[PDB]
Amino acid sequence: GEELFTGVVPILVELDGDVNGHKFSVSGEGEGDATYGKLTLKFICTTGKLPVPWPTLVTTLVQCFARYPDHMKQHDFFKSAMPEGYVQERTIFFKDDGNYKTRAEVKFEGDTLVNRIELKGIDFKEDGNILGHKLEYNAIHGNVYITADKQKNGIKANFGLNCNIEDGSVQLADHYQQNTPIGDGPVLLPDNHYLSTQSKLSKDPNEKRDHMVLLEFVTAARMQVADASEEELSECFRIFDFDGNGFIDREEFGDIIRLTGEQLTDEDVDEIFGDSDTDKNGRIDFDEFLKMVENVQPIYPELMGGVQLADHYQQNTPIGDGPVLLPDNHYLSYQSKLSKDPNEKRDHMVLLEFVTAAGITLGKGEELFTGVVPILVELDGDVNGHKFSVRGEGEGDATNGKLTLKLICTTGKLPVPWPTLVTTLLMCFARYPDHMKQHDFFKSAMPEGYVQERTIFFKDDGNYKTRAEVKFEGDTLVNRIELKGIDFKEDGNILGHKLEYNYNSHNVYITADKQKNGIKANFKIRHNIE
Ligand SMILES: [Ca+2]
Ligand SMILES: [Ca+2]
C-alpha cells in the first residue's frame, strides 16, 4: 500500500533504440492521472528522423497509470511496486517482418515517474511496413491480458496489437511482456485480468522535429459472466458451437480459440480444453463454457467486445437439371484481407479471400477450375430506400483456394460499409482436399451454376435479403446479385458507417438440403465496430 497516484504525476520517458543497425533516441514528457485512466505525453526523436513509424513504439514508450476500479484495487501490481518501481521486458513480433526486444525501468526519481528503455530490433525488411514507413498515424487500441508470475514475484502479459497499413490493410504486432519489481518489498499478485487501452496519436502545429502527441486511456477490467446478458452469453457460446449441435467439441474449440490471439500452441489448446471440460466427456456444455469465459479472460472481450454480429442463413440450389454432389456435413474456413487501390478514385474495395474445406477426417465441372478463372461481379442493392450498385472484376484460383476482387460503387458513395457486403459479393473457389472432392457441391453445379440466397440479420439493426446467380458465361465466372435491406437504423452501425475496414476469420458450416438438391449453411459474421 502506497498510492503516490492519488493526483496528477509528471512523466519522463527516455528511449535508446537500434533497429537493423539504424540507431535513434526518443525523449518524452507529460503527465499521468491514475484516478481517471489518463496519460498525456509528447515524444521527440532527438536524433532527427525516426527510422520506424511512431505507432510501432507507442507500447514501448507506463501501465502504473491504469485506472483500477474499486473492486479490482487488489489486482494492481504496477502501483504496488512503486516507488522503487518495476522492470518491464517485452518481445514484439511484427507479422511477416522483424521483432523488437525491450527492457525498461519504470520508477520514481523525486516526484517524477520515469520510463527508461533500451530497444533492439532485428531481421526487419528495409522496405517492409516498418522501415519503409507504410503505417498510418492514427490511434491504436487493445486489451492487455495480465496473469500472475508467482516465481518472479511479478506478472506476465500478452496481447496482439493491430495498426493500420496505408493501403487500408492491418499490421499485427504480437506482444509478450514480463514485469518484475526492482526492490524487495511486498507486491500485489493478481487474478487474471486485462487493461483496456486506447491510444490517440496527433501532431503539434508548433513543433518542427519528428514527434508524437499522445493521449491515452488505460482501464483495468475483468470479465465476469454476471455482467453479461443471457443473450450475450448465448451468442458467445454459438460462435464456438458452429455446427449448431449445442456442445463445443475439440475441433470447434481449436479453430475458435485461435481467434482470440495468435499466441497459442496445439498443447496450450489441449490444456485449456482439458481444464474446461470438467466432467471429461470430450465436449464443453454451456455451464462449463460459462466458467471457461472467466478462466480464459480473452474469450468474451475478443470474440464479442466491440463486435456487430451478422447472422447469415444461406441456401444454394442448382440452376441446371444435371447431377450434383450433395455433401456430408463440413465447413469452409474463410480468411479475408480488405485493402484499397491507391489509384482508384471511386469508392471501392479490394477483397482477397482464402477459402479451404475442412471438418471431414480422412478417417465433373471440377475441371473448369484447374485453372486461374476470371470473375465478374454485379450487385444491385436497395437498403432502406437507398439505391446503389457495385461492379467488380478479378480472378479465382481454386487449387490454392484464393480469390481476388476489385469492387467499385458505380452509384457514387456506398450507403453501407463495404464489410457488410463481403459475404454477398464465390464458394466454388474453395480448395477441397483430395479426401473431400465428392463433397464440393459448388463446382459440381458448373457450368450452368447455382442460385445463392441468404437472409442476413444484423443484431439490434435491420436485415439484408440477397439472391445471386453464380455461373459461367464463356470462360468468365459471373456472380449477379440483388440485395434488399429493410428496417435499418439511420444512425446504427451500418447506415451510420461505424464498422472498421477489416475482416475476421469465420467458418461456414455446410449441410445438405436433399429436398432442393442443394445445400444450406448458417454462420455468424463478426464485424468490428468503430
Ligand atoms: Ca458443436
Ligand atoms: Ca464436459
Author numbering: 5 to 65, 69 to 370, 386 to 447, 451 to 555
Text lifted from the article:
The recently developed FRET-based calcium sensor Twitch-2B uses a minimal calcium-binding moiety derived from the C-terminal globular domain of toadfish Troponin C (TnC) fused between the mCerulean3 donor and a circular permutation of the yellow fluorescent protein Venus (cpVenuscd), which acts as the acceptor. Large-scale diversification and screening, predominantly of the residues linking the minimal calcium-binding domain and the fluorescent proteins, has been used to optimize FRET changes in this indicator. Here, we report the high-resolution x-ray structure of the fluorescent proteins mCerulean3 and cpVenus within the biosensor Twitch-2B, as they undergo FRET and characterize the dynamics of this biosensor with B02-dependent paramagnetic nuclear magnetic resonance at 900 MHz and 1.1 GHz. We find that interdomain dynamics limits the FRET effect and show that a rigidification of the sensor further enhances FRET.
